[PDB]
């Protein structure tokens, strides 16, 4: 809720440019997942569940056997 | 280029059909949609064009017709 994807995505594009070497690789590994959430129409709020879905009963069936 | 005569499904011969339609893959849909139309006529209601057999199938009629050049097709 207290997050701004654009600023975080932007900063990450600078911190890769600043410290070139091993930490650039980590910042770039961090970049890809953050950069993805910008263009994505769905918000990363949905990563946490207030409600959880329930599969149709027939795909988890309780059928009595011949007995 | 003589084959004496074809019989059953191999009538009419495929090489003489491949000349008519762009490719076998076209010819399939060519014949199939026509056949679906011929099927529908008994119940787009145009055909059968060529004089059909007494107990003949729509696929046979369609595949006969394309060979006769009674039909034309448009590639999407």
């Amino acid at each position: 809720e207290n997050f701004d994807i654009d600023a975080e995505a932007e900063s990450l594009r600078e911190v890769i440019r600043s410290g070139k070497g091993q930490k650039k690789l980590r910042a770039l590994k961090r970049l890809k997942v953050v950069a993805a959430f910008q263009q994505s129409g769905n918000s990363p709020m949905g990563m946490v569940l207030d409600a959880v879905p329930v599969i149709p009963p027939e795909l988890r069936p309780m059928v009595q056997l011949d007995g | 280029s003589a084959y004496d005569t074809p019989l059953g499904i191999t009538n009419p011969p495929i090489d003489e059909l491949l000349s008519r339609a762009s490719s076998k893959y076209a010819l399939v849909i060519y014949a199939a949609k026509r056949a679906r139309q011929i099927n529908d006529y008994y119940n787009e209601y145009v055909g059968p064009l060529v004089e059909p057999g007494l107990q003949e199938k729509p696929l046979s009629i369609a595949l006969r017709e394309i060979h006769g050049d009674l039909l034309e097709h448009t590639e999407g």
């Binding site: 027939e58 069936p61 059928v63 | 893959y25 199939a32 679906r36 099927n39 529908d40 008994y42 119940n43």
Partner: protein
């Protein structure tokens, strides 16, 4: 020897229950699908892996359509 135009379908899996004893159909496997794709018989495969197996509206409509003698519904 097995044969099946239409009969009983399984409850949990909506394809024909397999077996000689249970009046079952045959397994149209992946290697069978590859051969069908390698031909490019699109409608055939799209019939086999739909109305001829899984599709609940297809399996009931196809029988009616064939016995009435109409076009096989998409």
């Amino acid at each position: 020897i097995h044969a099946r135009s239409t009969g009983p379908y399984s409850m949990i899996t909506q394809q024909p229950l397999g077996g000689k004893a249970q009046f079952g159909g045959q397994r149209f496997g992946e290697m069978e699908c590859w051969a069908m794709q390698a031909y490019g018989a699109a409608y055939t495969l799209q019939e086999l892996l739909t109305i001829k197996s899984d599709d609940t509206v297809g399996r009931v409509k196809v029988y009616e359509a064939i016995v009435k003698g109409e076009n096989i519904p998409e």
